[PDB]
Symmetry: C2
Subunit: 153 residues, 2 copies
């Protein structure tokens, strides 16, 4: 029963705390928490390859894709392990997060610990935007805030 | 040949970037970089158990000592896995770091990825301070800055 947490920060007002819990080695991971300072609406929510913040959220690099596949949505078969979809911010700029995902993991080949969680400026195409970028980054736009995913108590 | 990195931040002016590199699974780990905003002198440098920054450096928890040994020094036989000794800040408050350690690791049982790196207010007396604290926390003082250790490119 591993747990993990992530504090999200950026140059702007976007900030939040996300928690992860995976009660079983091969079970689903529950991720919940909230993010504030967001514009009302949908925002891309992904895990990027590197837990490197030497240069802001940019150093986090590309989507976490352990097995080179095209970009897609959380429910898709053809996706990136790191694609968690979108989080939704209400009129007050606050996004309450509660997701359950069984592709990402807190251990094994899909372990996201030590990697970066990012919330993007724009909603995630889920690869259905109809252009190059879509199938690549879902056109989520700039990285608003991020943090390294650490082992929690 | 895994690599890792950590951006150190706190409530004060202390901040820096540390890099880790372990070219071989069972080999030593090189850690280097620099920290600024430090008072001139020795400052404890340790890896703590949790990559949890929900409550500043406090949430990082206890030393990373998966082996229940008494506090030791970097070169001391019995030391915590997480005890990296001290880093030294020059008159300008800058500490240049270059260490090589073979107890911590970027993989396996001593894997420090996902955990927190902290630089302390006081020098780590390496368990040689003469009291009961020395052998617990080398009498290192408050946590000046920290960051979660992430996987680097």
């Amino acid at each position: 029963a591993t747990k993990a947490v992530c504090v999200l920060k950026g140059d702007g007002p976007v900030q939040g705390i996300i928690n992860f819990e995976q009660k079983e080695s091969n079970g689903p991971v529950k991720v919940w928490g909230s993010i504030k300072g967001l514009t009302e609406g949908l925002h891309g929510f992904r895990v990027h390859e590197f837990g490197d913040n030497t240069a802001g959220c940019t150093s986090a690099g590309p989507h976490f894709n352990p097995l080179s596949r095209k970009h897609g949505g959380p429910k898709d078969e053809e996706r990136h392990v790191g694609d968690l979809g979108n989080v939704t911010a209400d009129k007050d700029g606050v996004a309450d997060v509660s997701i359950e995902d069984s592709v990402i993991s807190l251990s094994g080949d899909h372990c996201i610990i030590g990697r970066t969680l990012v919330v993007h400026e724009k909603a995630d195409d889920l690869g259905k935007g109809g252009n190059e970028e879509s199938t690549k980054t879902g056109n989520a736009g700039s990285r608003l805030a991020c943090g390294v995913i650490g082992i929690a108590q």
